[PDB]
Symmetry: D2
Subunit: 326 residues, 4 copies
């Protein structure tokens, strides 16, 4: 078991030292619905996210990931996974303090990332006037910015990719669909519990840091929307890191930008390659053939930011780029 | 283990009968750019560049069109035995075989309406010769330079005299869940089912002519809306009959394009994957036949009653005669 | 000479018995900028329209086109064209009472359509905060709805297509790139004075009416935007007539919807086929073999409205569809 | 005056040391039709090119442009333009030795680029079975590779951009829609004689060479096709330089690759922004503030090739990239 115990990535919490600007980024540009406000946080969801929220913005001294929560495939699976972690000496705590959700098990990845598991999730129902004629779509697509449909995946930065990968595979039942190696060292791993290539990935922190967030990605499902989104970001002064293009690794149409708070956000295009074959061997990418893996087109990922910057960062984004530029 | 939700992995292949085998072959190679991996007797085997096994499509010469069979691959060898046993204990006649190139032990059976279905686990993983391998590691073969190449098989739609009976079989015997359905009063006239995050890999719609065990259509995946636009322009200028599309069905949020291959079978070109069912606990969405506009098409597309809701293969009348008959 | 006297379609005015709803349609869904408000009318422009406005919405008892103005290639061209019309005995009037524009020659088509020619047009300059980093783009693309870039073309419904075609060809110097005939009668003509396949089209009125507007089109330039637009119209209750698909005639990616006031509006995708060849013969389509001409894809153009409904209409859109169904 | 004398870019000839590989590139990947073969040359056309050919591939010791020919808007216009060049002391030669075309005037730009003017051009008619149901389309879109529709534009490298610019403006009547400057020095100019932002561009040669070709571009009109094309080139081992993305300058969706012979070829997506305004002022970009001009997206144009490599090149592409690091 453990194999089919995890259903999908339900939500993530981002910390931001410029909470209002981050909120404006997610509403004005990415068209997310705000469903709740309390204390230091604001809760949002894309029009096709199934629960009250998929994103939580929380004011903080620095940027980074407050947590990421995965929803299990049943309440039985939740008990199973939490039991596995506890039996494995992984410290965890049960709680039930989040709007729109129930009992949740909180724990740390081997590198310090805040992870959570839950089953109890309220099915979001929009106000009558905002319900879509498309029955599988809870809310009508907003008429603001270039609206994302839902959260897509999470990419964690780590001092030890294998340690994190092992935890997801062993305790959560994830399978690694693709990975990148240097010698016999894993510097990148993409993992999934369903037909998606991945919903959680882990890449080596080239600065020697640990427990950082590389990026949180949101789904468009249409390549043209990354083109529309980047033109928007360019004209409305949002820093563009790379893209739009497509990574050979995971066959993902990507667009990386930096929201006002300092976190890296990815806009994801076409779903791409779905893993229908139930027992496909993990594909291992090498340095010798990493060109296509990084980008099918002419896109070039900046060493001074993409492979080195993650949040929280001891240096500001500008300070960082200047330091690793050489 | 008694939990059967994950026993079926996906739709592996389908076989189409055609009274014009060569023209049908040309359709799938010249226009849809599929690779031919085997030839035997009166059949030709093909695969899209991203299909994982030796073939996902088999074209067989026959006096009439229709579906020879459809085979689903399980998630493990154990799942195959469990599903086969469920069917057997349910008094469903079944037969084991190992007849096909590129595959192993297979369980053959028929749906309540007579559709030829199959279950299997043993499948050879297709490996392209060095020269045809893609630099994209999850892609077995390079995308062909012929026509508008489809990536893989996507789903199948079966026409039936009793949708509810077919749905019940997939649900209780194969572990499928029904994501969406359409009812007319208190009668189910359409059901879309799945065992994974796809909205569906197998659908069933009521035969409005009174027939049964027919094939409504076999669908192939592009994943890009623009390719349905490119495809239809190609079909129009190269004399392939177009039924409807490109547009998008509200039901299953699928970008569709329906055309008729030379043999008479309806084939669908599928665009963006659309809406993935991430929520593992979502209730079936039920559409009313009386409030179906959005469900049929988000755009201005119109599905002809003279063919879309009445034509399936094999058909008592040839396509032309069928349309003329049901038009008035 | 003559051929190059008309530069492009500058603007159009739409009459609407539901002016507020019509304005909401163009701003909330089509993301057009409002540049001026005055009495019974509102002025708008797409973010890439060169002048203060390309669309004027005016409150009226019925729907329809108030007018359409074409800009000339020079001031000399304007005098030449106006003189040609006058010499042809076409009644015309000079004026200068519109915001953002100058001297204008007003006249009517052989079928009663209100047309105008002008040269003096102010070049819109957006406030600094709204200027685009793309220098050829006056304003940033709005963050509302699915923003149209600019006006594209006009399609006039007439009781005599050839009569209208002759006016544009002989007096304005337009060429007819494509046409549709039924026996010896022209029932459709698409005319241009530049690289575009057409900026003004004229189709036969099959109801015995005359001087009506079939539709006004706005440019996206991207096929996916018609897909996004129709999904928006569907979920936000705007009546969809046909599309998205592509007409073989003019090779245009189309999407036809009805705005609240009753006028037909087309959302236009890829520019399509540009007429680079300077002396290509007019392509003539036959009504007897028009399938590809109407739609490359599977789109079906409803006779109950597409070939029969135009504004102003004696019957409401609902009554019309019911009647011709 | 001469403002409308030139209609469009009719064709171009590319030299290649690997003629067969270059031919395969344009046929197997870009789906162009071969319409003629003579001596050491092959003639091709996109399915929507109006004449027998838009591209001529000629075997040669080095890469580069054999010539580029523009078609005038009339025979009178040809006489006028040639007259202007001759009166300006520009050496010219009249000839008529090209398949599918008639009398043409051959001359050189101030930097040595081989240019030509002509009016007589045969209208290509495809064999019965290859004619398209779309009447404005001469031949059916091929079922090979990702077929380009037609030639789009040319970009010339020059030791003196202003000199080349003056020639096109003064002698051909072209207008400069956009340009890039550094102080009082023009390092780039985009010119047109019609609604297109440009059909001919000129950029500074940073190596000190002259009369070279930066790139020849072909039209798709669809952004997705550049995405499709780049994936094809990547998996079929064609060197990719930059893109798919969009230049703020000229608002063009670009994809630059190197064909087997060494020439840079651009695949062009959406037509983009059409210059409908007849008297729009030239948009001048500053070299110091050109981020958006180079690319709206995150694309990065490599200095080691994009701004320095042109054909013919004294160094092989490999050696050139190595040299400029
Ligand atoms: O994350 C992806 O989907 C992707 O294609 C990027 C992979 C990047 C790397 O190979 C990488 C390697 C070491 C450290 C950081 C990043
Ligand atoms: O199959 C689909 O995705 C779809 O939108 C079509 C639904 C068609 C029907 O409702 C239907 C009803 C009765 C008989 C045949 C077809
Ligand atoms: O306007 C177009 O581009 C187009 O393809 C529409 C042509 C419609 C007609 O053939 C038509 C014929 C008679 C009366 C009205 C319209
Ligand atoms: O050609 C274009 O559309 C474009 O955006 C490229 C502009 C490149 C330059 O500014 C340039 C400047 C100096 C030397 C070569 C090239
Ligand atoms: Fe990612
Ligand atoms: Fe289907
Ligand atoms: Fe139109
Ligand atoms: Fe270019």
């Amino acid at each position: 078991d453990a194999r089919f115990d995890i259903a999908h990535l339900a939500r993530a919490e981002l910390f931001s030292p410029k909470p209002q600007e981050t909120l404006d980024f997610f509403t004005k540009f990415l068209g997310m619905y705000v469903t709740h406000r309390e204390g230091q946080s604001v809760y949002l969801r894309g029009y096709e996210d199934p629960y009250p929220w998929s994103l939580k913005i929380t004011e903080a001294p620095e940027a980074g990931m407050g947590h990421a929560a995965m929803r299990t495939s049943s309440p039985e699976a939740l008990e199973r996974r939490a039991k596995s972690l506890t039996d494995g000496n992984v410290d965890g705590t049960w709680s039930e303090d989040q709007f729109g959700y129930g009992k949740t098990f909180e724990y740390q990845s081997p590198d310090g990332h805040n992870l959570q598991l839950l089953w109890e999730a309220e099915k979001y129902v929009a106000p009558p006037e905002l319900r879509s004629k498309i029955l599988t779509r809870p809310s009508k697509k907003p008429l603001q910015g270039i609206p994302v449909k839902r959260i897509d995946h999470l990419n964690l930065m780590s001092s030890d990719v294998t340690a994190v990968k092992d935890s997801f595979e062993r305790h959560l039942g994830f399978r690694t669909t693709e990975r990148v190696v240097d010698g016999n060292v894993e510097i990148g791993a993409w993992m999934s519990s369903n037909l998606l290539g991945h919903e959680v990935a882990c890449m080596r922190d080239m600065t020697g840091g640990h427990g950082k967030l590389h990026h949180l990605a949101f789904f468009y499902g249409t390549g043209q929307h990354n083109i529309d989104a980047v033109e928007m970001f360019r004209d409305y002064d949002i820093q563009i890191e790379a893209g739009p293009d497509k990574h050979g690794i995971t066959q993902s149409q990507f667009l990386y930008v930096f929201e006002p708070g300092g976190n890296r956000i990815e806009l994801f295009g076409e779903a791409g390659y779905l893993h229908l074959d139930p027992d496909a061997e993990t594909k291992t990418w090498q340095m010798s053939d990493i060109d296509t893996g990084l980008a099918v087109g002419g896109a070039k990922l900046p060493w001074e930011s993409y492979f080195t910057y993650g949040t929280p960062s001891p240096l500001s984004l500008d300070q960082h780029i200047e330091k690793y530029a050489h």
